[PDB]
mmCIF file of C-alpha atoms in Angstrom:
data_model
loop_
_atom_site.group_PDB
_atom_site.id
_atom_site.type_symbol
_atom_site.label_atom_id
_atom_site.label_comp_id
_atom_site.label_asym_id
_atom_site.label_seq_id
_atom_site.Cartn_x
_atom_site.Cartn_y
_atom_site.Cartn_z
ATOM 1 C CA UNK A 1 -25.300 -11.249 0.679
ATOM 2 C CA UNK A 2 -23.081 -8.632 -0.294
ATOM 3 C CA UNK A 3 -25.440 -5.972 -1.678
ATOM 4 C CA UNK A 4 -23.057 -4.920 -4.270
ATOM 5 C CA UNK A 5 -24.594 -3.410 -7.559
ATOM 6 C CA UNK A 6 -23.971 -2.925 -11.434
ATOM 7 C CA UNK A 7 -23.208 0.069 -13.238
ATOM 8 C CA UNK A 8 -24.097 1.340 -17.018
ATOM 9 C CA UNK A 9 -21.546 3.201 -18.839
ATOM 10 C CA UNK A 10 -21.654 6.590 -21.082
ATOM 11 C CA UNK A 11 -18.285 6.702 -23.579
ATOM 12 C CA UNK A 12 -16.987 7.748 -26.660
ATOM 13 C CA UNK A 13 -13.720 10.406 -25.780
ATOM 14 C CA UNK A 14 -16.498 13.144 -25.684
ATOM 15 C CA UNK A 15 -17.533 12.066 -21.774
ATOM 16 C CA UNK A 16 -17.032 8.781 -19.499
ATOM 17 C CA UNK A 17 -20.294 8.640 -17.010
ATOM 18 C CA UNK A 18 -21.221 5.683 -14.777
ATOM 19 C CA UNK A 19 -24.569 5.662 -13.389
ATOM 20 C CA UNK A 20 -25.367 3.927 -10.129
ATOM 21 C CA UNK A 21 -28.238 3.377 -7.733
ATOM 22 C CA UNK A 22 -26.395 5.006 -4.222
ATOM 23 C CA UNK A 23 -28.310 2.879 -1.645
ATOM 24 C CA UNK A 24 -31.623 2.098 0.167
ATOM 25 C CA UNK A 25 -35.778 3.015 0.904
ATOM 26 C CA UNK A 26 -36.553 4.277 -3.056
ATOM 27 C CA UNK A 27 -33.248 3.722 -4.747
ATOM 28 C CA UNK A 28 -31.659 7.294 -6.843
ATOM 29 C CA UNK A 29 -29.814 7.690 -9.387
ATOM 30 C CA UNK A 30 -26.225 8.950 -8.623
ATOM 31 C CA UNK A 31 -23.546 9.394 -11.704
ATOM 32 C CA UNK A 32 -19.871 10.091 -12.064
ATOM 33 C CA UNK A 33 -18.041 11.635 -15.056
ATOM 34 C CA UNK A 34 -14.832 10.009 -15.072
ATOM 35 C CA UNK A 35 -11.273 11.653 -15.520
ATOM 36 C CA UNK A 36 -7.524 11.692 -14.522
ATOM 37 C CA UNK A 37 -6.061 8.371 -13.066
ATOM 38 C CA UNK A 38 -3.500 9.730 -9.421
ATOM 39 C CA UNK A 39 -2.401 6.375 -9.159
ATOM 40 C CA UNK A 40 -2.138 2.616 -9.443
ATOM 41 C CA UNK A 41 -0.870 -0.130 -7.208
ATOM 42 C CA UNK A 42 -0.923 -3.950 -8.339
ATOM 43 C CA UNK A 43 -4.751 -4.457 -8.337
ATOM 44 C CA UNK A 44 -6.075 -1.768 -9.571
ATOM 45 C CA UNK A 45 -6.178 2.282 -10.101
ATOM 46 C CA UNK A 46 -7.884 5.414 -8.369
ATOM 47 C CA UNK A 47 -9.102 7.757 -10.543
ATOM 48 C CA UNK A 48 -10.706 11.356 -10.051
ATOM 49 C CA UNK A 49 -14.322 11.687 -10.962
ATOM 50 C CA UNK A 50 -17.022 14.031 -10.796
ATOM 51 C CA UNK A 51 -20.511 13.509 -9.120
ATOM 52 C CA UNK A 52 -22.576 14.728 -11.476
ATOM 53 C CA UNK A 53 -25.864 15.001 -9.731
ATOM 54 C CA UNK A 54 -24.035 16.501 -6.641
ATOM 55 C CA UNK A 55 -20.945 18.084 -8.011
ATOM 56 C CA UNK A 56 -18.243 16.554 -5.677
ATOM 57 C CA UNK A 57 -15.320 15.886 -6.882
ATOM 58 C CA UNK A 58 -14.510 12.252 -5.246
ATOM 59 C CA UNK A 59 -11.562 9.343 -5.852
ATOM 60 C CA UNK A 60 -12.815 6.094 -7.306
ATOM 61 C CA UNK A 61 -10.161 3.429 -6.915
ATOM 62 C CA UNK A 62 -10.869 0.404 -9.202
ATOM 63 C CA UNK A 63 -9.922 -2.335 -7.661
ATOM 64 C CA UNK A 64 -9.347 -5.823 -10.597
ATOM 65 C CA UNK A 65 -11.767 -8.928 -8.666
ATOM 66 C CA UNK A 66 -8.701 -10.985 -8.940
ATOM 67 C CA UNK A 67 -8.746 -14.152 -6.439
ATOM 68 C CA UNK A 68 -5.395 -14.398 -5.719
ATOM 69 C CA UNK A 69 -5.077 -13.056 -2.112
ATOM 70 C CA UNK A 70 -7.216 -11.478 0.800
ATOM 71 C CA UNK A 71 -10.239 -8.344 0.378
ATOM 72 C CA UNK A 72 -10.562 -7.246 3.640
ATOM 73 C CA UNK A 73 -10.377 -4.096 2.069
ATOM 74 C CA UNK A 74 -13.993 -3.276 1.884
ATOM 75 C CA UNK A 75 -15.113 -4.809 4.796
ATOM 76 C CA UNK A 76 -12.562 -2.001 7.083
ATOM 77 C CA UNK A 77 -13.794 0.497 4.742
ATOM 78 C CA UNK A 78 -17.353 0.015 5.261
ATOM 79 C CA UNK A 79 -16.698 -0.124 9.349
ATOM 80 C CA UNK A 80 -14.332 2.596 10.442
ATOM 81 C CA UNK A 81 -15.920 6.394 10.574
ATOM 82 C CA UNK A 82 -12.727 8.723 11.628
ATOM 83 C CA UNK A 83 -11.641 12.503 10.955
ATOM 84 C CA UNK A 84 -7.877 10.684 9.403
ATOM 85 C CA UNK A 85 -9.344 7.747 7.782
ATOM 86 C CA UNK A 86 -10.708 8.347 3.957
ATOM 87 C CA UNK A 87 -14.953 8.084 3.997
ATOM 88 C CA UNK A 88 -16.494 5.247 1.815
ATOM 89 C CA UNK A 89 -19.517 6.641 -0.100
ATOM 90 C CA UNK A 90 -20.329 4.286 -2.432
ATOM 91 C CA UNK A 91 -19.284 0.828 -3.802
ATOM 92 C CA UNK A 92 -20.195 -0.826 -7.055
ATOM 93 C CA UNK A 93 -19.312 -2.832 -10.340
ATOM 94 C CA UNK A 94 -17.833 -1.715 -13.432
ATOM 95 C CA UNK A 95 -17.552 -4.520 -15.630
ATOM 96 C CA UNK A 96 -17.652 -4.229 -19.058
ATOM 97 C CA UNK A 97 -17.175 -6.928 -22.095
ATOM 98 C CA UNK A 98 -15.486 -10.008 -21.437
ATOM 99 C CA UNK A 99 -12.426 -9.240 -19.452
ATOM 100 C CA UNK A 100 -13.852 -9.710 -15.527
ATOM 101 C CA UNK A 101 -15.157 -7.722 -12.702
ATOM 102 C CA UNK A 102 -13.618 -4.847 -11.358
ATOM 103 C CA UNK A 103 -15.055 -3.184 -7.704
ATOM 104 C CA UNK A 104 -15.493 0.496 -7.295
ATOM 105 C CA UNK A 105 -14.603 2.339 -3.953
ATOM 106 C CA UNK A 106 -16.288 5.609 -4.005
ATOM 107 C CA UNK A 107 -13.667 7.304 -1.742
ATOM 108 C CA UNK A 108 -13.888 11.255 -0.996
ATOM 109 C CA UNK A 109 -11.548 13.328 -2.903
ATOM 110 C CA UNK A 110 -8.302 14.487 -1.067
ATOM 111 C CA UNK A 111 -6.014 15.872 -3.955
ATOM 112 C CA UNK A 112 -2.588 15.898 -2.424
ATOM 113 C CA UNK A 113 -0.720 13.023 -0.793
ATOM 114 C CA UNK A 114 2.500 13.075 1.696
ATOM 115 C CA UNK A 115 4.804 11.921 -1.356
ATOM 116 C CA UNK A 116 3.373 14.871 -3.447
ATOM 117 C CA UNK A 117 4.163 17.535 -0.940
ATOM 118 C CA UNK A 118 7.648 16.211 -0.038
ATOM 119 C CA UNK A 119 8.381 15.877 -3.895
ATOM 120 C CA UNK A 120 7.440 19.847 -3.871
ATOM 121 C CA UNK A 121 10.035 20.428 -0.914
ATOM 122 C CA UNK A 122 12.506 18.646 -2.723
ATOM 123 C CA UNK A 123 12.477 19.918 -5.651
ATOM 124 C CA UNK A 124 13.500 23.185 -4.181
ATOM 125 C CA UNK A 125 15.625 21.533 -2.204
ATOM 126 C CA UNK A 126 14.837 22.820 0.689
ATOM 127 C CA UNK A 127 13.558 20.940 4.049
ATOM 128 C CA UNK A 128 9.858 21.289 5.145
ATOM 129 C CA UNK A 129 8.665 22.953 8.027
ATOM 130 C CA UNK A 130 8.620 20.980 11.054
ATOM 131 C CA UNK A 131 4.772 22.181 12.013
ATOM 132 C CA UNK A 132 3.812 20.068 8.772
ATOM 133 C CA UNK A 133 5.490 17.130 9.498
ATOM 134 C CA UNK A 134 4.282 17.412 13.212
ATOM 135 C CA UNK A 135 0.878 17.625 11.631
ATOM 136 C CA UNK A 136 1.404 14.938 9.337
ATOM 137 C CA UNK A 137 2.789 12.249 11.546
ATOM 138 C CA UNK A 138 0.325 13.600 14.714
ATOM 139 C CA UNK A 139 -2.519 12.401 12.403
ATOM 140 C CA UNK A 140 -1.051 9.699 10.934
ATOM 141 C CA UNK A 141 -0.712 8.304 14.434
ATOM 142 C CA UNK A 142 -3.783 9.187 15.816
ATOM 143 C CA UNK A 143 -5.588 7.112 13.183
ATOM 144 C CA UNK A 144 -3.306 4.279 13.575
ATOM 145 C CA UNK A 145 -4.350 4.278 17.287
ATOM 146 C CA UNK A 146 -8.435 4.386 15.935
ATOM 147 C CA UNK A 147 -7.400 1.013 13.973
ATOM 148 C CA UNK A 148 -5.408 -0.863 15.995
ATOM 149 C CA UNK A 149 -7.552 -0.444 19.017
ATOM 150 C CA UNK A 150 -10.993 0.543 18.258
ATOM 151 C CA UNK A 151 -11.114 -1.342 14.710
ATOM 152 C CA UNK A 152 -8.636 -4.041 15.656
ATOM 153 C CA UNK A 153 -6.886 -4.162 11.881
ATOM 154 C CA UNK A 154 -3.307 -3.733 11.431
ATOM 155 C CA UNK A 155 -2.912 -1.487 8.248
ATOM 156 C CA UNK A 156 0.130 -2.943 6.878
ATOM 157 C CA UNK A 157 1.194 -0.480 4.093
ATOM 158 C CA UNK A 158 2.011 2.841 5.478
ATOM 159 C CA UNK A 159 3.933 4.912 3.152
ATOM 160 C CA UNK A 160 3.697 8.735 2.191
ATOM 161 C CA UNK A 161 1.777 7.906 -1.135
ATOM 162 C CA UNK A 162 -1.324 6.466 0.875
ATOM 163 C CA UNK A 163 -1.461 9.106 3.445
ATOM 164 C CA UNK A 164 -3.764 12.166 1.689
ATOM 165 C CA UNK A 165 -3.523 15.748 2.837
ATOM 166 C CA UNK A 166 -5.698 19.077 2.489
ATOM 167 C CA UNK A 167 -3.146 21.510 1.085
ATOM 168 C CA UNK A 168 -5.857 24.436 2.962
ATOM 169 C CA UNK A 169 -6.613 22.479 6.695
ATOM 170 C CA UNK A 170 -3.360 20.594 6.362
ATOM 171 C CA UNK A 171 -6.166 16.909 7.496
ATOM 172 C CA UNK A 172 -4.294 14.244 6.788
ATOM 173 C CA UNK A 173 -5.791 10.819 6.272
ATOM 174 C CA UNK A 174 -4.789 7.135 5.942
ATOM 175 C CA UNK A 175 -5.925 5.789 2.371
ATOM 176 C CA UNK A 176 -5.985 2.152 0.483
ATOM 177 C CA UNK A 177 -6.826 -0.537 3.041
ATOM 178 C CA UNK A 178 -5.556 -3.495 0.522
ATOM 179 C CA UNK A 179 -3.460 -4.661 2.800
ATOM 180 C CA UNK A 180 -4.927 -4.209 6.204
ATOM 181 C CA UNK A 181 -6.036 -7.026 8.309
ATOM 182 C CA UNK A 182 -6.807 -7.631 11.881
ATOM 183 C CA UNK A 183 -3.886 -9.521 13.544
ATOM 184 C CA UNK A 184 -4.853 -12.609 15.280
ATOM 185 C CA UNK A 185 -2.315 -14.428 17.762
ATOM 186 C CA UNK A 186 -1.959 -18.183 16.210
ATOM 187 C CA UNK A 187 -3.263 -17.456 13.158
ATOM 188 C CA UNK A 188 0.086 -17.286 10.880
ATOM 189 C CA UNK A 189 0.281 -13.947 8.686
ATOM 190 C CA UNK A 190 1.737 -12.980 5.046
ATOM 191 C CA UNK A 191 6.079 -12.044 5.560
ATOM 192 C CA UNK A 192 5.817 -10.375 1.934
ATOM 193 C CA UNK A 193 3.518 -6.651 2.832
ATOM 194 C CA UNK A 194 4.375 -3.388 2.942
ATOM 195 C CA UNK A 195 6.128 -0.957 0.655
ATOM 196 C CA UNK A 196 9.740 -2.094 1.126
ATOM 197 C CA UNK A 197 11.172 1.181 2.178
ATOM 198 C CA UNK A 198 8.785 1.179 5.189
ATOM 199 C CA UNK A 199 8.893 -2.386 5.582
ATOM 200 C CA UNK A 200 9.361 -3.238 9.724
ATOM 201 C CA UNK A 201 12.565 -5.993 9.584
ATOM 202 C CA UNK A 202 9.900 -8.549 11.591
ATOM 203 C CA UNK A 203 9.094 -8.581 7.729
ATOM 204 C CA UNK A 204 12.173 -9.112 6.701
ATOM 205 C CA UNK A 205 13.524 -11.824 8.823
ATOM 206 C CA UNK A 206 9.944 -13.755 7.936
ATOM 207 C CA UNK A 207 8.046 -13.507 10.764
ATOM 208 C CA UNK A 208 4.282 -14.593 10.295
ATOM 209 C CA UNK A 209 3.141 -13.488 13.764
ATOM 210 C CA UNK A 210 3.749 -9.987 13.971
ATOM 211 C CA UNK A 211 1.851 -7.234 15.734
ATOM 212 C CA UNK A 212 0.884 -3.630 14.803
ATOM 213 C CA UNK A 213 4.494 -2.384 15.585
ATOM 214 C CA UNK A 214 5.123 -2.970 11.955
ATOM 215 C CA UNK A 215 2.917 0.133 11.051
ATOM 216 C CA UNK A 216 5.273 2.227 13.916
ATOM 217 C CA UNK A 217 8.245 1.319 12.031
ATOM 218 C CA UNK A 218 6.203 2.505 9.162
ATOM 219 C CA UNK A 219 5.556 5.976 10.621
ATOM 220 C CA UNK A 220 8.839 5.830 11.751
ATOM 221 C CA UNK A 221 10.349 5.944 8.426
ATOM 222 C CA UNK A 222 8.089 8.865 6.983
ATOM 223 C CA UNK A 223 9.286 10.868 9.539
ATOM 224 C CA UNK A 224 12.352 10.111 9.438
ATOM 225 C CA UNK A 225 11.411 10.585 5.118
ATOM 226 C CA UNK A 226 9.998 13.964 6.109
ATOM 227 C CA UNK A 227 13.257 14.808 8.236
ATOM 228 C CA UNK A 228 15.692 13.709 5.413
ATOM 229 C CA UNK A 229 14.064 15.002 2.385
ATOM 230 C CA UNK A 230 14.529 11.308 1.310
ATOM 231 C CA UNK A 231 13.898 7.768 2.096
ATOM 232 C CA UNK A 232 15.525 6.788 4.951
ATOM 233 C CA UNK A 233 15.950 2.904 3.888
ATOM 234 C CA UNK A 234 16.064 2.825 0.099
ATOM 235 C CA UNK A 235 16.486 -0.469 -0.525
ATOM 236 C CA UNK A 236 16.389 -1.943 -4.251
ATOM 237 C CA UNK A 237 15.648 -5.723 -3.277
ATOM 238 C CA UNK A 238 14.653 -8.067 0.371
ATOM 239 C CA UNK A 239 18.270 -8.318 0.989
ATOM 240 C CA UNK A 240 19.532 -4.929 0.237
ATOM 241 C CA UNK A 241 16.549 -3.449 2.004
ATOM 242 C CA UNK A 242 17.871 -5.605 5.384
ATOM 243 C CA UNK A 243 21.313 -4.062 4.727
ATOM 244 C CA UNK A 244 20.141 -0.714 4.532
ATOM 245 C CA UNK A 245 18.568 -0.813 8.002
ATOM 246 C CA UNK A 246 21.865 -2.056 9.258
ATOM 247 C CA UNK A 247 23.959 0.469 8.260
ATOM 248 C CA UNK A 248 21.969 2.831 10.865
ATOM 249 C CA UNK A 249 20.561 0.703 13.685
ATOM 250 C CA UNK A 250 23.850 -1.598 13.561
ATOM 251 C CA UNK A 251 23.807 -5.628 13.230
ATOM 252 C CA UNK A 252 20.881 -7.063 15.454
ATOM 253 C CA UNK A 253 21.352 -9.288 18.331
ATOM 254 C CA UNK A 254 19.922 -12.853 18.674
ATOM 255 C CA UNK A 255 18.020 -11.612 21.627
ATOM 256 C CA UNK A 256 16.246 -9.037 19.408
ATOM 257 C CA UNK A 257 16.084 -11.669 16.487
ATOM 258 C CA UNK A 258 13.864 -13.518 18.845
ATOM 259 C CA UNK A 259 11.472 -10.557 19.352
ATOM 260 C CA UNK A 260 11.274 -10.096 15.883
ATOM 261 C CA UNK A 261 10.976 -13.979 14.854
ATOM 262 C CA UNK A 262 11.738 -16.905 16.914
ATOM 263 C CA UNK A 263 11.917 -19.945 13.928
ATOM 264 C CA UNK A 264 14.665 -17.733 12.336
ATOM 265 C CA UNK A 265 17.537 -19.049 13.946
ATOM 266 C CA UNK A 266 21.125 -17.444 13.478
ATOM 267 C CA UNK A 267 21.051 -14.558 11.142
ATOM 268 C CA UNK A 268 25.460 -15.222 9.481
ATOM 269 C CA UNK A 269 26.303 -11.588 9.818
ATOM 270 C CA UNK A 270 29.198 -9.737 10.880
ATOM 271 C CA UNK A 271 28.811 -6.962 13.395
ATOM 272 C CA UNK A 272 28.698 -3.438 11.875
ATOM 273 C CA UNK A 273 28.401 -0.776 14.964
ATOM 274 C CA UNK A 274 25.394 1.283 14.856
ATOM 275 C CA UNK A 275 25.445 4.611 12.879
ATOM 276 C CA UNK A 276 23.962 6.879 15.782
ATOM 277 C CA UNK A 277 20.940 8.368 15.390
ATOM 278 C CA UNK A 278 23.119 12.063 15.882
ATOM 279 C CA UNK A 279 24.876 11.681 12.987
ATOM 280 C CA UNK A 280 21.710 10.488 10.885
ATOM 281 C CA UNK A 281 20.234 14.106 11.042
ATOM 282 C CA UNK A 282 21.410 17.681 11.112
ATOM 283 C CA UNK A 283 22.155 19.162 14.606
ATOM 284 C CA UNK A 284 19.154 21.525 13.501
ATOM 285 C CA UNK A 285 16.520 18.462 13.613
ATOM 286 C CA UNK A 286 14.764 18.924 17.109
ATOM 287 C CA UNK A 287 15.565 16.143 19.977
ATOM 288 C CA UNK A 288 12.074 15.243 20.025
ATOM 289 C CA UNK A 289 12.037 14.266 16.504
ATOM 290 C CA UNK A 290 15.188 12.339 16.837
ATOM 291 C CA UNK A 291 13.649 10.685 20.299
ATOM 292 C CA UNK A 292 10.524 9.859 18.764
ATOM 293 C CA UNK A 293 12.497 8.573 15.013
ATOM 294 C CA UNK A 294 14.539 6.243 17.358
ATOM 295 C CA UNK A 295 11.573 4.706 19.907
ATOM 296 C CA UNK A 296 10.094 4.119 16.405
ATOM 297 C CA UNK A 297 12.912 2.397 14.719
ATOM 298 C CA UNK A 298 13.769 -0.500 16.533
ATOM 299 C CA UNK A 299 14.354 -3.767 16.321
ATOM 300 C CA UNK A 300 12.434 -6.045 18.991
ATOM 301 C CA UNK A 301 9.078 -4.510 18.467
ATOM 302 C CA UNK A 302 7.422 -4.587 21.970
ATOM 303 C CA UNK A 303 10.019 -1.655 22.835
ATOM 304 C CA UNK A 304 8.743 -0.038 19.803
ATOM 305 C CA UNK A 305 6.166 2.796 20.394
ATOM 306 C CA UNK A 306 2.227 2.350 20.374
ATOM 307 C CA UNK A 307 0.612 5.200 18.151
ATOM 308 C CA UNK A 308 -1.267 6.783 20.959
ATOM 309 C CA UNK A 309 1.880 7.019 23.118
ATOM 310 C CA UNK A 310 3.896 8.563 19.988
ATOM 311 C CA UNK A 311 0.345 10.684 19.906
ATOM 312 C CA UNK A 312 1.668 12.165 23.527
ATOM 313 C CA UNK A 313 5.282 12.412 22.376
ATOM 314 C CA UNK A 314 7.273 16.151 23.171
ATOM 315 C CA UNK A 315 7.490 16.467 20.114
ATOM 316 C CA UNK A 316 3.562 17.384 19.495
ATOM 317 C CA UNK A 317 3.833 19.553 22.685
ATOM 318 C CA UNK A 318 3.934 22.322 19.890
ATOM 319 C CA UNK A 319 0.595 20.783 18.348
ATOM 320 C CA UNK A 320 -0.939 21.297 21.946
ATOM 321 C CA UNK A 321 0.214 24.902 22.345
ATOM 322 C CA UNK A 322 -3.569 26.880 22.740
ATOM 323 C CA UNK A 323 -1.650 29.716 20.689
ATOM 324 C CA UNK A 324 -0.675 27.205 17.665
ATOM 325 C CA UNK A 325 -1.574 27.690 14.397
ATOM 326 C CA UNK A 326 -0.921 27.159 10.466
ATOM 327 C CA UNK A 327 1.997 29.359 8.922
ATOM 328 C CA UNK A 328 -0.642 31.526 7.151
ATOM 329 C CA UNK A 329 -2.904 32.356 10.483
ATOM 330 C CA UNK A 330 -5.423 29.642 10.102
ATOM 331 C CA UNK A 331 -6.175 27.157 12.905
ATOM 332 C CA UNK A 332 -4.586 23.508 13.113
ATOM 333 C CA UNK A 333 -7.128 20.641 11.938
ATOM 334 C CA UNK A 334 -8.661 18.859 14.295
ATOM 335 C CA UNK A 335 -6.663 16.919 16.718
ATOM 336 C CA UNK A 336 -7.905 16.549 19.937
ATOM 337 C CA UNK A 337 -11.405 15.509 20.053
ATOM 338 C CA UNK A 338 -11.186 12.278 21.065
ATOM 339 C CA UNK A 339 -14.195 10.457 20.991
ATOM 340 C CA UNK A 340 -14.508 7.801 24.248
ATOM 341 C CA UNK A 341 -13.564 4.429 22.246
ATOM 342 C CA UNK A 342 -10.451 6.334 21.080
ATOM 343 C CA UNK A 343 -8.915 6.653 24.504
ATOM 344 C CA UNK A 344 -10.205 3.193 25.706
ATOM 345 C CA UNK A 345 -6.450 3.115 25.896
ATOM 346 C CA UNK A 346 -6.494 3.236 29.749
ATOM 347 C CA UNK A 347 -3.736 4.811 31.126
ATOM 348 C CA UNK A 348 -5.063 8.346 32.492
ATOM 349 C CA UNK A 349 -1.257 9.457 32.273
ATOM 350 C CA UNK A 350 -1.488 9.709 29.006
ATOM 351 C CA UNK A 351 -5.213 10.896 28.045
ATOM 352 C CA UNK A 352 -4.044 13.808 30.514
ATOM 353 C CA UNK A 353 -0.806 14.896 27.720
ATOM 354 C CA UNK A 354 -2.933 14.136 25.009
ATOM 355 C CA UNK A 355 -5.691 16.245 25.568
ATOM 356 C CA UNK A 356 -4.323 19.721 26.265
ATOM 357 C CA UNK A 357 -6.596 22.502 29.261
ATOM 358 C CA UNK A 358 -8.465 24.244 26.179
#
């Protein structure tokens, strides 16, 4: 089935084109000049291109057809339609002499990412306003919520370098599904996902049946990234990485090794006391951050936050002020319009917080 198609390539230094059919009832020809690779990961790399009949700039990622391990990837693209999810356009091939097949995801072009805009903070080494980060994590949230619940995937790789923002609206939204996949109870999972810094310590402690806490541990540690002006768990290896998280939360118990993986068994540690959550920030940092950092970053991960609830935190009461707006004047993206399937999420408590009078 698949309905994928070829491409034909232009070259020579002087211009990079790739023509392509779009879709279908007549068929049309659609092109892209190539330019400027904004990243990599282990299969693959995006890279900026022009539509050249249209004259959108969008973000091809070129994903290498190696077997290895899992798609997924193209299947959640084509399925999830969302205002903090990136839009598929088009998909294709790009093969070229010998070598193998590589698949094109025609993604729309979002120039900045989180990890570019805190990199600008730091540099100047000065901390970022709090609206952004309320922003930032707000929408990260909110389309965590649209994929755990109305999608049913578990994106798996949260981390400031796939989350793209509009440096004019301040939209944020979630990018590379590689990793995502739709958590099924019995069915045994990979342990080794997720950009180590943001990796939930389920991961660590090789758990295989895990839930989509691990992405609110995630989200938990770019705000707590957002808060610091640094990664909050900067660990250089597995080990070093579980270390890390210890030095904060404190050693865990056996009742919350359990939550996070049963078949472990003892965990030969000695007890370090827990580095409170005070003392991680400045006195500056509001509460509500520090409330909503902590429900994120916890151990056993039922008592970790859903992203809807996190959604309705104090901490976007700001967000939900009818008087709120960016720095320079303009309005806040959108935040609020909630379509129906989003707030399948029963409880009336919360759609009632969530969705402020205006």
């Amino acid at each position: 089935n698949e309905k994928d198609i070829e491409a034909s390539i232009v070259s020579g230094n002087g211009t990079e084109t790739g023509q392509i059919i779009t879709t279908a009832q007549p068929k049309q020809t659609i092109s892209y000049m190539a330019e400027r690779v904004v990243g990599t990961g282990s299969f693959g790399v995006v890279f900026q291109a022009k539509c050249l009949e249209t004259g959108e700039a969008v973000a091809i990622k070129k994903v290498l057809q190696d077997k290895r391990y899992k798609n997924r990837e193209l299947q959640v693209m084509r399925t999830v339609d969302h205002p903090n999810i990136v839009k598929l356009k088009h998909c294709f091939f790009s093969t070229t002499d010998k070598d193998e097949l590589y698949l094109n995801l025609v993604l729309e072009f979002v120039p900045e990412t989180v990890y570019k805009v805190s990199k600008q903070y730091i540099r100047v080494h000065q901390h970022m306003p709090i609206i952004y980060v309320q922003l930032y994590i707000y929408q990260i949230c909110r389309a965590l919520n649209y994929l755990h619940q109305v999608i049913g995937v578990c994106h798996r790789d949260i981390k400031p370098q796939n989350l793209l923002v509009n440096p004019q609206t301040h939209q944020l939204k979630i990018c590379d599904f590689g990793s995502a996949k739709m958590l099924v109870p019995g069915e045994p999972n990979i342990s080794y996902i997720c950009s180590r810094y943001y990796r939930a310590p389920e991961l660590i402690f090789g758990a295989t049946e895990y839930t989509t806490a691990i992405d609110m541990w995630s989200v938990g540690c770019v705000l707590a990234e957002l808060l610091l002006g640094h990664p909050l768990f900067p660990g250089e290896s597995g080990v070093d990485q579980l270390v890390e998280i210890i030095k904060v939360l404190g050693t865990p118990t056996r009742e919350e090794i359990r939550c996070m993986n049963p078949h472990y068994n003892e965990f030969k540690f000695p007890q370090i006391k827990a580095h409170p959550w005070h003392k991680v920030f400045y006195k500056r940092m509001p509460p509500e951050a520090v409330d909503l950092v902590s429900r994120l970053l916890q151990y056993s991960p039922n008592l970790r936050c859903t992203a809807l609830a996190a959604c309705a935190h104090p901490f976007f009461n700001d967000l939900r002020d009818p008087n709120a707006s960016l720095p320079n004047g303009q309005p806040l993206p959108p935040l609020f319009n909630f379509t129906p399937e989003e707030l399948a999420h029963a409880p009336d408590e919360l759609r009632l917080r969530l969705i402020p009078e205006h």
